[PDB]
Amino acid sequence: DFVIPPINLPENSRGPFPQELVRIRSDRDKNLSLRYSVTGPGADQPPTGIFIINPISGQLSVTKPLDRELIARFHLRAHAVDINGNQVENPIDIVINVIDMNDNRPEFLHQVWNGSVPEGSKPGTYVMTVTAIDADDPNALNGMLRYRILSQAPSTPSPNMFTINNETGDIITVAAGLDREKVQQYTLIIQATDMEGNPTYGLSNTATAVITVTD
Amino acid sequence: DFVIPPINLPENSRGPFPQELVRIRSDRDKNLSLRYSVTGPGADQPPTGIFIINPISGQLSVTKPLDRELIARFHLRAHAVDINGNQVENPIDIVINVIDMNDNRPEFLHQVWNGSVPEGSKPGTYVMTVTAIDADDPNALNGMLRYRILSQAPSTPSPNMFTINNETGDIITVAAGLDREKVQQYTLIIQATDMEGNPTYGLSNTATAVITVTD
Ligand SMILES: [Ca+2]
Ligand SMILES: [Ca+2]
Ligand SMILES: [Ca+2]
Ligand SMILES: [Ca+2]
Ligand SMILES: [Ca+2]
Ligand SMILES: [Ca+2]
């Protein structure tokens, strides 16, 4: 059987509500007066009453904004009965897809990450890994993260002792002169940004990396 | 049988093209590899190639802007055959509705209308009827017309001897002093405006009414 095409609806709709979607009817209406209903999560199951259908026309509507991070897809069924109570069609599958909007900023697992690097390490020495997560769709830009260092303290012998791999979160030395007797700890502020790290449209968050110089 | 919901598309789309509409597939794809096509006016019949479908996905698309005043609705059918040439579904009806935009200004049947009114007629005397038509949807604002008088020449004994019923196009005297020996002919410019006569968003046109005073 051919499947009723899915309805694709972006989350966080402004409305106004209720909002008409599509019209579901039976061709048996040619000789019979029909009554339409819908069942399933979003309809007669939790969360109740988000989608509704006009008993007479079969016009399907949505009554509230949706949130993809709560429910990504709704499986409903449409029902047809005539005015004498006769069931005239087998109930038919309907699919509503909720389309992602970038409505979550990246989140770091820990607010403070700790790591260490030996005294006198050569440039290009691996130090530690920091990472974030994004609650939006991973397969979209809305959930794709990039990393950068915003500040380093203290600023000696070089104000940029480290860099960070912008996709992996790996922190690595790019400079020499790490001496425990001179400077014992560095504090870096790490930023994560979604939308592939786009500075204009991405959402960002920050975290702290503390790096101790060892013997 | 439940009918595939109609696709409602406004005319004069900006695109860009090709533009994805909906996805039509068969649930027999669970065990079979399927090939999809579409037939009908707009597809394989004049006008050819306006709607197309991806053989593999079943994604339906439109390739050009539409014009409601040429074709208001398209009746297509979707077809499913497997890779061994087996027809796996009966072809299914698809309906595309073209939604009206206000893209036609009112048109007068004649550019010059002629009528007459007897000398010394009392105020409220019926004179003639002028009308226009609109090629847009009559049941929408885009094709609903209102009428008004823009100018009268000459401007004596009163610069407004006539009025016009704004919905009927009936022209009627509102003033006395029609005297053939004094002024023999009036020339009125009549405007028609759609969108229920809305001066901001309506489209307009004009015509000329020549009214002779008789004995
Ligand atoms: Ca959300
Ligand atoms: Ca989201
Ligand atoms: Ca995000
Ligand atoms: Ca048109
Ligand atoms: Ca039109
Ligand atoms: Ca019009």
CSV table of C-alpha atoms and ligand atoms in Angstrom, one decimal:
chain,number,residue,atom,x,y,z
A,1,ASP,CA,0.0,0.0,0.0
A,2,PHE,CA,1.1,3.6,-0.7
A,3,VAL,CA,1.7,5.4,2.6
A,4,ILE,CA,0.1,8.8,3.4
A,5,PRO,CA,2.9,11.3,3.0
A,6,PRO,CA,4.5,12.5,6.3
A,7,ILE,CA,3.7,16.0,7.6
A,8,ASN,CA,6.9,17.9,8.3
A,9,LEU,CA,6.5,20.7,11.0
A,10,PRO,CA,9.2,22.9,12.5
A,11,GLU,CA,9.3,23.1,16.3
A,12,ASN,CA,8.5,26.3,18.2
A,13,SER,CA,5.8,27.5,15.8
A,14,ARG,CA,4.4,31.1,16.5
A,15,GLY,CA,1.0,30.1,15.2
A,16,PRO,CA,-1.5,31.4,15.5
A,17,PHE,CA,-3.4,28.3,16.8
A,18,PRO,CA,-5.2,26.2,15.9
A,19,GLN,CA,-3.2,25.7,12.7
A,20,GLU,CA,-4.6,23.7,9.7
A,21,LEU,CA,-2.3,21.0,8.3
A,22,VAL,CA,-3.9,18.7,5.7
A,23,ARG,CA,-7.4,17.2,5.0
A,24,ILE,CA,-7.9,13.5,5.5
A,25,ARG,CA,-11.1,12.0,3.9
A,26,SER,CA,-12.5,8.8,2.6
A,27,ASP,CA,-13.8,8.4,-1.0
A,28,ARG,CA,-16.7,6.5,0.4
A,29,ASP,CA,-18.1,10.0,1.2
A,30,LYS,CA,-19.7,9.8,-2.3
A,31,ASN,CA,-22.7,7.8,-0.9
A,32,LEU,CA,-22.3,8.0,2.8
A,33,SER,CA,-22.1,10.8,5.5
A,34,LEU,CA,-18.9,10.2,7.4
A,35,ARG,CA,-17.4,11.1,10.8
A,36,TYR,CA,-13.6,11.4,11.2
A,37,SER,CA,-11.4,11.0,14.3
A,38,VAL,CA,-7.7,10.6,15.1
A,39,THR,CA,-5.9,8.3,17.7
A,40,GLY,CA,-2.4,8.1,19.1
A,41,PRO,CA,0.2,10.0,21.1
A,42,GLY,CA,-0.5,13.7,20.6
A,43,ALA,CA,-4.2,12.9,20.0
A,44,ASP,CA,-6.0,10.6,22.4
A,45,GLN,CA,-2.8,9.5,24.2
A,46,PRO,CA,-0.2,11.6,26.1
A,47,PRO,CA,0.3,14.4,25.3
A,48,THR,CA,-3.5,14.7,24.7
A,49,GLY,CA,-5.1,17.1,22.2
A,50,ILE,CA,-2.0,18.4,20.4
A,51,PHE,CA,-3.4,17.3,17.0
A,52,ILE,CA,-7.2,17.3,16.3
A,53,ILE,CA,-9.4,16.6,13.3
A,54,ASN,CA,-12.7,18.1,12.2
A,55,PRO,CA,-15.3,15.4,12.5
A,56,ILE,CA,-17.1,16.7,9.4
A,57,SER,CA,-14.4,17.9,7.0
A,58,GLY,CA,-11.5,15.8,8.1
A,59,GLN,CA,-9.3,18.8,8.4
A,60,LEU,CA,-6.3,18.0,10.6
A,61,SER,CA,-4.9,20.8,12.9
A,62,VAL,CA,-2.2,21.4,15.5
A,63,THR,CA,-3.1,23.3,18.7
A,64,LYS,CA,0.3,24.1,20.3
A,65,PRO,CA,4.0,24.7,19.4
A,66,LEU,CA,6.1,21.5,19.4
A,67,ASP,CA,9.5,20.8,20.9
A,68,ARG,CA,11.7,18.3,19.0
A,69,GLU,CA,13.8,17.4,22.0
A,70,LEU,CA,10.6,16.1,23.7
A,71,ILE,CA,9.0,14.2,20.8
A,72,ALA,CA,10.6,14.0,17.4
A,73,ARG,CA,7.8,12.2,15.6
A,74,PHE,CA,4.2,11.4,16.2
A,75,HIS,CA,2.5,8.2,15.0
A,76,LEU,CA,-1.3,8.9,14.6
A,77,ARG,CA,-4.2,7.0,13.0
A,78,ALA,CA,-7.2,8.4,11.2
A,79,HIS,CA,-10.6,6.6,11.6
A,80,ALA,CA,-13.8,6.8,9.5
A,81,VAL,CA,-17.3,5.8,10.6
A,82,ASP,CA,-20.6,6.7,9.0
A,83,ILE,CA,-23.6,8.3,10.8
A,84,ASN,CA,-25.2,4.9,11.4
A,85,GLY,CA,-22.2,3.8,13.3
A,86,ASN,CA,-20.7,1.7,10.6
A,87,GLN,CA,-16.9,1.6,10.3
A,88,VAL,CA,-16.2,2.3,6.6
A,89,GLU,CA,-12.4,2.2,6.5
A,90,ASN,CA,-9.5,0.4,8.2
A,91,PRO,CA,-7.7,3.1,10.4
A,92,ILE,CA,-4.8,4.6,8.5
A,93,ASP,CA,-1.3,5.5,9.6
A,94,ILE,CA,-0.3,9.2,9.7
A,95,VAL,CA,3.2,10.5,10.5
A,96,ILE,CA,4.1,13.9,11.8
A,97,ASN,CA,7.9,14.8,11.8
A,98,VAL,CA,9.1,17.6,14.0
A,99,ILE,CA,11.9,19.5,12.3
A,100,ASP,CA,14.8,20.8,14.3
A,101,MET,CA,15.4,24.4,15.3
A,102,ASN,CA,18.7,25.5,17.0
A,103,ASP,CA,17.1,26.1,20.4
A,104,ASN,CA,19.8,24.6,22.7
A,105,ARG,CA,23.3,26.0,23.4
A,106,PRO,CA,26.2,23.6,23.9
A,107,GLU,CA,26.7,22.2,27.4
A,108,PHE,CA,29.9,21.1,29.0
A,109,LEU,CA,29.8,17.8,31.0
A,110,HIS,CA,32.0,19.4,33.7
A,111,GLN,CA,32.5,23.1,34.5
A,112,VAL,CA,36.1,22.5,35.5
A,113,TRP,CA,38.5,20.1,33.7
A,114,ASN,CA,41.9,19.2,35.1
A,115,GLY,CA,45.1,18.0,33.3
A,116,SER,CA,48.8,18.0,33.5
A,117,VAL,CA,51.9,18.4,31.3
A,118,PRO,CA,55.6,17.7,32.2
A,119,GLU,CA,58.2,20.4,32.6
A,120,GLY,CA,60.1,21.2,29.4
A,121,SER,CA,57.7,19.4,27.1
A,122,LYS,CA,58.4,19.9,23.4
A,123,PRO,CA,55.9,21.9,21.2
A,124,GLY,CA,53.1,19.6,20.0
A,125,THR,CA,52.8,17.7,23.3
A,126,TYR,CA,49.3,16.3,24.0
A,127,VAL,CA,47.9,17.6,27.4
A,128,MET,CA,44.2,16.7,27.8
A,129,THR,CA,40.7,16.6,26.1
A,130,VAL,CA,37.7,18.7,26.8
A,131,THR,CA,34.3,18.2,25.2
A,132,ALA,CA,30.7,19.5,25.1
A,133,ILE,CA,27.4,18.2,23.9
A,134,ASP,CA,24.4,19.7,22.1
A,135,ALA,CA,20.8,18.7,22.6
A,136,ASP,CA,19.8,19.7,19.1
A,137,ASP,CA,19.9,17.4,16.0
A,138,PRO,CA,23.5,16.0,15.7
A,139,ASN,CA,23.0,15.5,11.9
A,140,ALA,CA,22.2,19.2,11.5
A,141,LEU,CA,24.3,22.3,12.0
A,142,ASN,CA,22.3,23.1,15.2
A,143,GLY,CA,24.1,20.3,17.0
A,144,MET,CA,27.6,20.4,15.4
A,145,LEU,CA,30.3,21.8,17.8
A,146,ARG,CA,33.6,23.5,17.4
A,147,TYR,CA,36.2,24.5,20.1
A,148,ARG,CA,38.5,27.4,20.8
A,149,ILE,CA,40.6,28.9,23.7
A,150,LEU,CA,39.5,32.4,24.8
A,151,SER,CA,42.1,33.3,27.5
A,152,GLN,CA,45.2,32.0,29.3
A,153,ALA,CA,46.4,33.0,32.7
A,154,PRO,CA,49.1,33.7,33.5
A,155,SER,CA,50.5,35.1,30.2
A,156,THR,CA,54.1,33.9,30.5
A,157,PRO,CA,56.6,33.0,29.0
A,158,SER,CA,54.2,33.2,26.1
A,159,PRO,CA,50.5,34.3,26.2
A,160,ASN,CA,49.6,31.4,24.0
A,161,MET,CA,51.3,28.2,25.3
A,162,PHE,CA,48.5,25.9,24.1
A,163,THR,CA,46.1,25.5,21.2
A,164,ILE,CA,43.0,23.3,20.9
A,165,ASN,CA,42.0,21.0,18.0
A,166,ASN,CA,38.8,22.7,16.9
A,167,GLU,CA,36.8,19.5,16.3
A,168,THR,CA,38.2,17.0,18.8
A,169,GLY,CA,38.6,19.2,21.9
A,170,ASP,CA,42.3,18.0,22.3
A,171,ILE,CA,44.5,20.6,24.1
A,172,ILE,CA,48.1,20.6,22.9
A,173,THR,CA,51.2,22.7,23.6
A,174,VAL,CA,52.3,25.0,20.7
A,175,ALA,CA,55.2,26.7,22.6
A,176,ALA,CA,58.3,26.1,24.8
A,177,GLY,CA,59.4,27.3,28.2
A,178,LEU,CA,57.1,25.3,30.5
A,179,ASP,CA,59.0,25.6,33.8
A,180,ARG,CA,57.4,24.5,37.1
A,181,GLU,CA,59.7,26.7,39.2
A,182,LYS,CA,58.5,29.7,37.2
A,183,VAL,CA,54.8,29.1,36.6
A,184,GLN,CA,53.0,26.1,38.2
A,185,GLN,CA,49.5,26.3,36.8
A,186,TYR,CA,47.7,27.7,33.7
A,187,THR,CA,44.0,28.5,33.6
A,188,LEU,CA,42.3,28.4,30.2
A,189,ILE,CA,38.8,29.4,29.3
A,190,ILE,CA,37.4,27.1,26.6
A,191,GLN,CA,34.5,28.0,24.4
A,192,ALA,CA,32.2,25.6,22.5
A,193,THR,CA,30.1,26.9,19.6
A,194,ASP,CA,27.5,25.1,17.4
A,195,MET,CA,26.5,25.7,13.8
A,196,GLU,CA,30.0,24.4,12.8
A,197,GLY,CA,31.6,27.1,14.9
A,198,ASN,CA,29.9,30.0,13.1
A,199,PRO,CA,30.5,33.2,15.1
A,200,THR,CA,27.4,35.0,13.8
A,201,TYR,CA,24.7,32.4,14.2
A,202,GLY,CA,26.1,29.7,16.5
A,203,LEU,CA,25.2,29.4,20.2
A,204,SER,CA,28.1,29.2,22.7
A,205,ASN,CA,29.0,28.1,26.2
A,206,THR,CA,32.2,28.1,28.2
A,207,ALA,CA,34.2,25.9,30.7
A,208,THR,CA,37.5,26.1,32.6
A,209,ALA,CA,40.6,23.9,32.1
A,210,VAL,CA,43.3,23.9,34.8
A,211,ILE,CA,46.7,22.6,33.7
A,212,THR,CA,49.4,21.8,36.2
A,213,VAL,CA,53.1,21.6,35.2
A,214,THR,CA,54.7,18.5,36.6
A,215,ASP,CA,58.3,17.4,37.2
B,1,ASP,CA,-10.4,4.3,0.6
B,2,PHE,CA,-8.8,7.2,2.4
B,3,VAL,CA,-7.6,9.7,-0.2
B,4,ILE,CA,-4.0,11.1,-0.3
B,5,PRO,CA,-4.3,14.6,1.1
B,6,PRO,CA,-4.2,17.4,-1.6
B,7,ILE,CA,-1.1,19.5,-2.0
B,8,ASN,CA,-2.0,23.3,-1.8
B,9,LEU,CA,0.5,25.5,-3.7
B,10,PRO,CA,0.3,29.3,-4.2
B,11,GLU,CA,0.8,30.5,-7.8
B,12,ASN,CA,3.9,32.6,-8.8
B,13,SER,CA,6.4,30.9,-6.5
B,14,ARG,CA,9.9,32.4,-6.4
B,15,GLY,CA,11.5,29.1,-5.8
B,16,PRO,CA,14.2,28.2,-6.0
B,17,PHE,CA,13.5,25.3,-8.3
B,18,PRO,CA,13.2,22.4,-8.2
B,19,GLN,CA,11.1,22.5,-5.1
B,20,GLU,CA,10.4,19.5,-2.9
B,21,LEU,CA,6.7,18.9,-2.1
B,22,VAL,CA,6.0,15.5,-0.3
B,23,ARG,CA,7.3,11.9,-0.4
B,24,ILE,CA,5.1,9.2,-1.9
B,25,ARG,CA,6.2,5.6,-1.1
B,26,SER,CA,4.9,2.1,-0.9
B,27,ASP,CA,5.1,0.0,2.3
B,28,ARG,CA,6.0,-2.9,0.1
B,29,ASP,CA,9.5,-1.4,0.1
B,30,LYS,CA,10.1,-3.5,3.2
B,31,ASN,CA,11.0,-6.6,1.1
B,32,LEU,CA,11.3,-5.1,-2.5
B,33,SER,CA,13.3,-2.5,-4.2
B,34,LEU,CA,10.9,-0.1,-5.9
B,35,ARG,CA,10.8,2.4,-8.7
B,36,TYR,CA,8.4,5.3,-8.6
B,37,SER,CA,6.9,7.5,-11.4
B,38,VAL,CA,4.0,10.0,-11.9
B,39,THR,CA,1.5,10.4,-14.8
B,40,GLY,CA,-1.0,13.1,-15.8
B,41,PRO,CA,-1.3,16.7,-16.9
B,42,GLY,CA,1.7,18.5,-15.5
B,43,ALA,CA,3.7,15.2,-15.6
B,44,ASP,CA,3.7,13.1,-18.7
B,45,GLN,CA,0.9,15.1,-20.3
B,46,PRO,CA,0.7,18.8,-21.3
B,47,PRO,CA,2.2,20.8,-19.8
B,48,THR,CA,5.0,18.3,-19.5
B,49,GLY,CA,7.5,18.1,-16.7
B,50,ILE,CA,6.1,20.6,-14.2
B,51,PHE,CA,5.9,18.0,-11.5
B,52,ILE,CA,8.5,15.2,-11.2
B,53,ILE,CA,9.3,12.4,-8.8
B,54,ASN,CA,12.6,10.8,-7.7
B,55,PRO,CA,12.6,7.2,-9.0
B,56,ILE,CA,14.3,6.0,-5.8
B,57,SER,CA,13.0,8.0,-2.9
B,58,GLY,CA,9.6,8.9,-4.2
B,59,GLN,CA,10.2,12.6,-3.5
B,60,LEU,CA,7.7,14.7,-5.5
B,61,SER,CA,8.9,18.1,-6.7
B,62,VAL,CA,7.7,21.1,-8.8
B,63,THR,CA,10.1,22.6,-11.5
B,64,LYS,CA,8.4,26.0,-12.4
B,65,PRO,CA,6.1,28.7,-11.0
B,66,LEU,CA,2.4,28.0,-11.5
B,67,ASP,CA,-0.4,30.3,-12.8
B,68,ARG,CA,-3.9,29.6,-11.4
B,69,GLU,CA,-5.6,31.3,-14.3
B,70,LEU,CA,-4.1,28.7,-16.6
B,71,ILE,CA,-4.6,25.6,-14.6
B,72,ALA,CA,-6.3,25.7,-11.1
B,73,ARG,CA,-5.7,22.0,-10.2
B,74,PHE,CA,-3.7,19.1,-11.4
B,75,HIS,CA,-4.8,15.5,-11.3
B,76,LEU,CA,-1.7,13.2,-11.1
B,77,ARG,CA,-1.2,9.5,-10.4
B,78,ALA,CA,1.8,7.8,-8.7
B,79,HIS,CA,3.0,4.4,-9.9
B,80,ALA,CA,5.1,1.7,-8.2
B,81,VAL,CA,7.0,-1.1,-9.9
B,82,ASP,CA,9.8,-3.3,-8.5
B,83,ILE,CA,13.3,-3.8,-10.1
B,84,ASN,CA,12.2,-7.0,-11.8
B,85,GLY,CA,9.4,-5.1,-13.6
B,86,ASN,CA,6.6,-6.2,-11.3
B,87,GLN,CA,3.8,-3.7,-10.7
B,88,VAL,CA,3.4,-3.7,-6.9
B,89,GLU,CA,0.6,-1.2,-6.4
B,90,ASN,CA,-2.5,0.1,-8.2
B,91,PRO,CA,-1.7,3.7,-9.4
B,92,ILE,CA,-2.9,6.3,-6.8
B,93,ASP,CA,-4.6,9.6,-7.3
B,94,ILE,CA,-2.7,12.8,-6.3
B,95,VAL,CA,-4.3,16.3,-6.3
B,96,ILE,CA,-2.4,19.6,-6.6
B,97,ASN,CA,-4.4,22.7,-5.9
B,98,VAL,CA,-3.1,26.0,-7.1
B,99,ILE,CA,-3.9,28.8,-4.6
B,100,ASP,CA,-4.9,32.3,-5.9
B,101,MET,CA,-2.7,35.4,-5.8
B,102,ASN,CA,-4.1,38.8,-6.8
B,103,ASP,CA,-2.1,39.0,-10.1
B,104,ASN,CA,-4.8,40.5,-12.3
B,105,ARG,CA,-6.2,44.1,-12.3
B,106,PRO,CA,-9.9,44.6,-13.1
B,107,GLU,CA,-10.9,45.0,-16.8
B,108,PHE,CA,-13.8,46.9,-18.3
B,109,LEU,CA,-15.7,45.2,-21.1
B,110,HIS,CA,-15.9,48.5,-23.0
B,111,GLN,CA,-13.6,51.4,-22.7
B,112,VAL,CA,-16.4,53.8,-23.4
B,113,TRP,CA,-20.0,53.4,-22.0
B,114,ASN,CA,-22.9,55.6,-23.3
B,115,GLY,CA,-26.1,56.5,-21.5
B,116,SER,CA,-28.8,59.2,-21.3
B,117,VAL,CA,-30.9,61.0,-18.7
B,118,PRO,CA,-33.9,63.3,-19.3
B,119,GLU,CA,-33.8,67.1,-18.7
B,120,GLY,CA,-35.0,68.1,-15.3
B,121,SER,CA,-34.8,64.6,-13.7
B,122,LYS,CA,-35.4,64.4,-10.0
B,123,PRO,CA,-32.4,63.4,-7.7
B,124,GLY,CA,-32.2,59.6,-7.5
B,125,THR,CA,-32.9,59.0,-11.2
B,126,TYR,CA,-31.3,55.9,-12.6
B,127,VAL,CA,-29.1,56.6,-15.6
B,128,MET,CA,-27.0,53.6,-16.6
B,129,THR,CA,-24.9,50.6,-15.5
B,130,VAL,CA,-21.1,50.1,-15.9
B,131,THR,CA,-19.3,47.0,-14.8
B,132,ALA,CA,-15.9,45.3,-14.8
B,133,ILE,CA,-14.5,41.8,-14.4
B,134,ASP,CA,-11.5,40.3,-12.6
B,135,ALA,CA,-9.7,37.2,-13.8
B,136,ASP,CA,-8.6,36.2,-10.2
B,137,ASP,CA,-10.6,34.0,-7.9
B,138,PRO,CA,-14.2,35.5,-7.5
B,139,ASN,CA,-14.7,33.8,-4.1
B,140,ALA,CA,-11.6,35.6,-2.8
B,141,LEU,CA,-10.8,39.3,-2.2
B,142,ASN,CA,-8.5,39.2,-5.3
B,143,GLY,CA,-11.6,39.1,-7.6
B,144,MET,CA,-14.1,41.2,-5.7
B,145,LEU,CA,-14.7,44.6,-7.3
B,146,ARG,CA,-16.0,48.0,-6.0
B,147,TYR,CA,-16.8,51.1,-8.1
B,148,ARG,CA,-16.3,54.9,-7.7
B,149,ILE,CA,-16.4,58.1,-9.8
B,150,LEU,CA,-13.1,60.0,-10.1
B,151,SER,CA,-14.0,63.1,-12.2
B,152,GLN,CA,-16.9,64.8,-13.9
B,153,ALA,CA,-16.7,67.3,-16.8
B,154,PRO,CA,-18.1,69.8,-17.0
B,155,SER,CA,-18.5,70.8,-13.4
B,156,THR,CA,-21.8,72.7,-13.5
B,157,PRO,CA,-24.4,73.4,-12.1
B,158,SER,CA,-22.9,71.1,-9.5
B,159,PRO,CA,-19.4,69.3,-9.7
B,160,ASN,CA,-21.1,66.1,-8.5
B,161,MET,CA,-24.4,65.5,-10.4
B,162,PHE,CA,-24.1,61.8,-10.2
B,163,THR,CA,-23.0,59.0,-7.8
B,164,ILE,CA,-22.4,55.3,-8.5
B,165,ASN,CA,-23.6,52.3,-6.4
B,166,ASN,CA,-20.2,51.0,-5.2
B,167,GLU,CA,-21.1,47.3,-5.7
B,168,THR,CA,-23.6,47.2,-8.6
B,169,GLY,CA,-22.0,49.8,-10.9
B,170,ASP,CA,-25.4,51.6,-11.2
B,171,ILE,CA,-24.9,55.4,-12.0
B,172,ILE,CA,-27.7,57.6,-10.5
B,173,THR,CA,-28.3,61.3,-10.2
B,174,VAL,CA,-27.9,62.9,-6.8
B,175,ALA,CA,-28.5,66.5,-7.8
B,176,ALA,CA,-30.8,68.8,-9.7
B,177,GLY,CA,-30.4,71.3,-12.5
B,178,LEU,CA,-29.9,69.0,-15.5
B,179,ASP,CA,-30.7,71.4,-18.4
B,180,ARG,CA,-30.0,70.4,-22.0
B,181,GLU,CA,-29.8,74.1,-23.2
B,182,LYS,CA,-27.1,74.7,-20.6
B,183,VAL,CA,-25.0,71.6,-20.6
B,184,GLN,CA,-25.6,68.8,-23.1
B,185,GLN,CA,-23.1,66.1,-22.1
B,186,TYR,CA,-21.2,64.9,-19.0
B,187,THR,CA,-18.0,62.8,-19.1
B,188,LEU,CA,-17.3,60.7,-16.0
B,189,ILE,CA,-14.2,58.7,-15.3
B,190,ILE,CA,-15.2,55.4,-13.5
B,191,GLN,CA,-12.7,53.4,-11.4
B,192,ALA,CA,-13.0,49.7,-10.5
B,193,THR,CA,-10.9,48.3,-7.6
B,194,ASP,CA,-10.5,44.8,-6.4
B,195,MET,CA,-9.8,43.5,-2.8
B,196,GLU,CA,-13.3,44.8,-1.8
B,197,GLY,CA,-12.3,48.3,-3.0
B,198,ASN,CA,-9.3,48.5,-0.6
B,199,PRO,CA,-7.3,51.6,-1.6
B,200,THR,CA,-4.0,50.3,-0.2
B,201,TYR,CA,-3.8,46.8,-1.6
B,202,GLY,CA,-6.4,46.7,-4.4
B,203,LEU,CA,-5.6,46.8,-8.1
B,204,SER,CA,-7.5,49.3,-10.2
B,205,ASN,CA,-8.5,50.2,-13.7
B,206,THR,CA,-10.6,53.0,-15.3
B,207,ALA,CA,-13.2,53.5,-18.0
B,208,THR,CA,-15.2,56.4,-19.5
B,209,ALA,CA,-19.0,57.0,-19.2
B,210,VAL,CA,-20.6,59.6,-21.5
B,211,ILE,CA,-24.0,60.8,-20.4
B,212,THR,CA,-26.2,62.8,-22.8
B,213,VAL,CA,-29.1,65.0,-21.4
B,214,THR,CA,-32.3,64.4,-23.4
B,215,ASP,CA,-35.5,66.3,-23.9
C,1,CA,CA,13.2,22.4,21.4
C,2,CA,CA,16.1,21.7,18.7
C,3,CA,CA,22.6,23.9,19.4
C,4,CA,CA,-1.9,34.1,-12.4
C,5,CA,CA,-4.6,34.9,-9.8
C,6,CA,CA,-7.7,41.1,-9.1
